[PDB]
Amino acid sequence: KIKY
């Protein structure tokens, strides 16, 4: 959730 911290990238996409």
Added chain:
Amino acid sequence: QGRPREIINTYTEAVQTVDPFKATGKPHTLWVAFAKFYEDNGQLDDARVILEKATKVNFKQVDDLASVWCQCGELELRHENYDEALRLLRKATALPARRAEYFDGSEPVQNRVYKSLKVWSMLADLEESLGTFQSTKAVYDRILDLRIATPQIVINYAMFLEEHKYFEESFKAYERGISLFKWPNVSDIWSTYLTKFIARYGGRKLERARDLFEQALDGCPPKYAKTLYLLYAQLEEEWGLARHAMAVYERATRAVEPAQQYDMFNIYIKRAAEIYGVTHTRGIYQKAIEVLSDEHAREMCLRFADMECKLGEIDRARAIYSFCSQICDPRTTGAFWQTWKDFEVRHGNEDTIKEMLRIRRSVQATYNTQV
């Protein structure tokens, strides 16, 4: 070479083929012919070993297997007494019941209707000569197809009617005919068997017969040419009710001629001619003039126009002529204008009132002639 006999030896070379490769049906047909050469070899000697050796090829997935077993069943029909032929044909016919087809190959489905129904038909319920068909043998054939089959649907329903002759076989034939093939392919035979079975089983002039017959065929495509009516319309008119016959005549008139044929038009105009009366012929004249293809509204409006002018007043003849001006493209014609003018002259016009009819008809023809 030396086929019937030479040394009574080379027949084995005739049965000798080998060379294993990809083939379908050739080793089975040549193996059945080799089983006939075995029939000239002393019959049952070496025949059962050939049938058992050629009976198992891979696992199912072939139409040649059951065709060779069914061929052995035909040779068993050539065997005279049906005791042993019925035992061996009963076990060999009962073997595909456990497993049929669709293991590996180029066939997407099993397709056990043809071969399996052929072996089950050869075992029992041949509908020709051989007997020994149990009351459950028809359900054994319908279960042999296991989904739907209708090459024999007429003969299968005829066999179920021979063993039973009740409404259960008629409803099962209607469901097997509907699920058999879409559209009135086997459903038309289900409709014929529905009318004949409706008369000979469900009773004459039955409401449930018309409810089912009108329910299955309700929307329908146009059958062979077309029938939406004559079976149910004639059956309703012959049932003794003059009320529902007219309702079935109008509802049958809506679906009458999807192809715009004059047949159904004359059948509706004749149905309204033999019943009701004048006003019904006028309503059929307006309805016939409403539906138009090419010559339909012109011919129907002309016939009903002359029939109305010969009976009623001349108002429907003049208005029917004005309606004949907007329809019936000029082409050649010329007879309807002179016949309508003469009919107007016979109505008491003569000098007066005919100047606008002849001048308006010629002015309408010249206006339709363009330049």
Added chain:
Amino acid sequence: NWIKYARFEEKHAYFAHARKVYERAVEFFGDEHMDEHLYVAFAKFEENQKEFERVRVIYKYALDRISKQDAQELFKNYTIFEKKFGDRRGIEDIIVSKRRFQYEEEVKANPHNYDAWFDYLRLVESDAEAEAVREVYERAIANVPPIQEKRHWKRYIYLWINYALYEELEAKDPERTRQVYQASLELIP
């Protein structure tokens, strides 16, 4: 979505979770009536597995549907499909064939002319004892005297024929025939 999951699960073999998911999904989605929702899945799994208990339970749950049995032709064609498949023939399936949608549509015709009363009498030929025949004859007798001259005379013959068949059904010239003679006094012209 239930038909799609039932089709994919149908091609997936199994069908235990497809039937349990069909009943569970049909139970959670129930609001007013099932109609094309549960009955289509009940007929799909029914005819797929060839189970008479599921067809009888589906026919029982379909009879409890409100809003005039939900969709008329849907439940009628489905009940005729499972009917014709399972048993059909005569007796039960014949009386139910005259009953259900046929007896409801012929039951309430919104009476206007004598044809609807003649259809209600045709469906009332074999129904119950003479009480229902007398109720249909008395209900259709005063239903349509449309006029003095012409028509109603044939409607008066329809009331005299309904009272003659209803009164002559269980007896021969009973007191109901004398009452039919009192109604034959022509209160019309």
Added chain:
Amino acid sequence: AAAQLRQYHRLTKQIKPDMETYERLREKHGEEFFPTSNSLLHGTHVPSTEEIDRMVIDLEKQIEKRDKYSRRRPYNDDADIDYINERNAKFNKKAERFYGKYTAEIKQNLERGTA
């Protein structure tokens, strides 16, 4: 209306919804036009990261120039399908016109005349 099923056959479509409809039928015709692949061998290339939708690595090595050409083929196929709109369908009749705008005004005038 109809949600989904397993089958392939002819249809009608070609209607007003346009973009959404042409993209749905184009993706369905593209997916049905391209069958399955060697992904079983990619089933050897499969290991432990497959599921768990939210992705730890969304790039990796891609595949090769193979998948580049195999990706370029449906682009040229969509270019050829996009090159199909209408035909010339011309003739000498009635009166003359001026370039395109008069022909478009003739089509719109014919659409307004028939109502």
